[PDB]
DNA sequence: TCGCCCCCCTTCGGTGCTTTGCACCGAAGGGGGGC
């Protein structure tokens, strides 16, 4: 087979990202994985005259307790030429989020049978570090379609359809969607029957080269207003400040009849009786918050963005939008490992879960605004990462003015 | 000799050509030292004479070596370096003696004339053209180019290291039970073989190196403890830094203080409790490296303490992979932290310090967390794993913090250790309003063109105050308004502001700040008994807030 | 009158915010150390 010509985007150079420190066990895994890949000619040893680099690490899902190499090609992918312009893009099926069970399979290995354009290989360099810097970094670059490179599903696209056509011919009501190195495969069968057909799809792939998601209960979490029998000045202030902020999202929400319940310079703990005209304004507002917002539609040409707020006792709320205040989805993530100890683990798991949902729903991951210090995140996140893809993120320190999402 | 190893291909950056710069005058001793190396380097094949059809040049000089009277030829390739392609450097970090395990037999070897034993890409050689002056005004200098890696060229370290890595690799795979720390051309070689078998393996390593053109001269071949290595001294059971000599002056320049702080940071890897905050303060706001700086009283005290610590002999020990790593941290004051990493008590592998000020406003719990993160990263680098922590913070303090703080945060497996001063939260905002406490509605506004402003409050008890402010900002007036409510209230108070900015700072419970104003607010928060702090949107006619907003105008 | 690497402390300047300063952050100055 012969290579597809690949370009970076005009005026961009390849990635130049430093390798971060790795534990002993991740380093040993990488050395074993890489030397066997080298023997098989999938990667080649290179020197320092290649000026590019991308960080490499490793993950170990615990119900398949072998290590998986992960190269963080996020920078390379941003600088790689788009394949929609070259008509090599993959379409997203709208039926996948309608299935009651979706299983993720890691099909990254199929890429290793297609060679990569020789002029593009130098941009795929990575460096394996050394414990206590006993030696210099050991450098490789790819000779084949790399895992985690956005160009690999696009170039492998026609071959992947050929391997899949018999299976979905046989199974017209199962929906398969390729995202990066992953197949998302959904159906409406009984949980043990679904699993059985996943094992059949595997064996068809194995003859050439996770856990169950449930999109049916990805409950939307609306903005809720407290219900009390007596209301303090402080309660009404907190209530008014919350609806004022929500008037940026919802249409025609009033607080003028609540704001002047608070007329005068009052004690925060003073109990203020609700007037007719305020109970009027309030229940109307609860109805508006009850069912979602009119006029908000997904735009595939714009990026998705996700915001997350820690709420405490293992609860994490999130919103996904493309334009501010036009949320395509609001939700609540909760996960108990039985300890309740790790904020960073919980947040890392919340990020995989939310990005997973965006893949299922829209076909791509959002850029996350993470409520954590950059350096606290960077100290620990790879300990808990279990996906073969990595979303874009940035770090925000946003003190909660209101607790809008709780 | 010159390695028969393949050259590494190298390019100039696109569009660029080679350097064209004239040689400068040098001394007779230096010129004769260069001629002894040049006409000898030509005889060794390291350089070749060229002529005028090569249009490139670059100037040369010589510096002394620590290896007795030997000189080191170096060329000023500043221009060629800018025009040479980038490289991905393979030296990722610096090996540390605390990461070594105990070994029965140890050798340290050094390659002779290391860079000159690696050939330079033939197509690139012409860009390295230079000229040896020889008294300058006698005759025009002779022109040469390099056939081997030049000292002073941007690409030489990486191409040497990568070549050294390839030459060692036949040998490393063949002897997995022998540790070879490879740093530039310096080879630490440890094993658990008896000295006879070990010396047999050394001789074999030396012969393999020599077939690839790397000599190992006898003068740099150490076979007996203590080994001089990477600036340390390796004993069988322990290691020490080579002696650290602190400058002693009666008048100090900025540059003197910069040198002193550097030496202390280097010392802090094995000397526990070094501090440099007060000495470093002296560097702030200076404007010349030769400017005389009088030591403050605090800096003399800090210096005297460091000198006392440095008088005492210290050693680190080596790593035992079969035992846990343990990291213990102490607070030293003013955002300074010191730590020790050990496996058996009172036997440190190494020490360190963390003293960085991150952010305008912070607290001890956050900085402790930063120190933990620095130590975690350093432990991965040196040992491949993170340690267990012993921390001077109560479990309840930590639990109070990560349940009241809105950002995700975490500290790995740790045990409380009672070494005062403990890390603590210095105040805690109430989650609910306080019954029977005054309610202050605060506001401050500033005119952004004017820089004049006002800060004020109204109170459910009928109290009112407006203060004029000069050369201030919007954000400052809001902090000022809160400052005034804390100043005029009792031990318990309810505060209502419309500044998300001010709420944002105070809600993170900072205990120190780069801002004198935020610092004053902090000391007031610390003296209070209870404080409930609440936010409302501005300019929405909300009772109390609207009245104080009217009054600030 | 040189090169490459790590570390710390200080300063400077670019980025984005429903801003008008402010907080954050990466790069570059100085120093230490290695070869
Ligand atoms: C790491 C290096 C090798 C080891 O340096 P080295 O001290 O072991 O000396 P070398 O092996 O050359 O000969 P020797 O071992 O017989 O003494 C040397 O090739 C060159 C390089 N190096 C060292 N110092 C300097 C310097 O300041 N400026 C430059 N540009 N390069 C330098
Ligand atoms: Mg040498």
Residue numbers in the entry:
A (entry chain B): 5 to 213, 231 to 427
B (entry chain A): 1 to 553
From the paper:
In our previous studies, we examined various combinations of amino acid substitutions in motifs A–E and found that the HBV-RT-associated 3MB mutant comprising Q151M in motif B and Y115F/F116Y in motif A is useful as a surrogate for structurally studying HBV RT since HIV-1 harboring RT3MB turned out to be highly sensitive against typical anti-HBV NAs, ETV, and 3TC. E-CFCP is a 4′-modified and fluoromethylenated NA that exhibits potent antiviral activity against both wild-type and drug-resistant HBVs but less potent against human immunodeficiency virus type-1 (HIV-1). The present study aimed to elucidate the mechanism of potent antiviral activity of E-CFCP against wild-type and drug-resistant HBV using HIV-1 with HBV-associated mutations in RT.
We also determined the structures of HIV-1 RT4M complexed with DNA:ETV-TP/dGTP at 2.32 and 2.30 Å resolutions, respectively, as reference models for comparison. In contrast, the bound ETV-TP/dGTP are well ordered and superimposed with each other with an RMSD of 0.2–0.3 Å, and their average B-values were similar to those of polypeptide chains and DNA (~ 60 Å2), suggesting that the bound ETV-TP/dGTP is rather static within the N-site. ETV-TP has no 4′-modification but has an exocyclic methylene that pushes the Met184 sidechain backward.
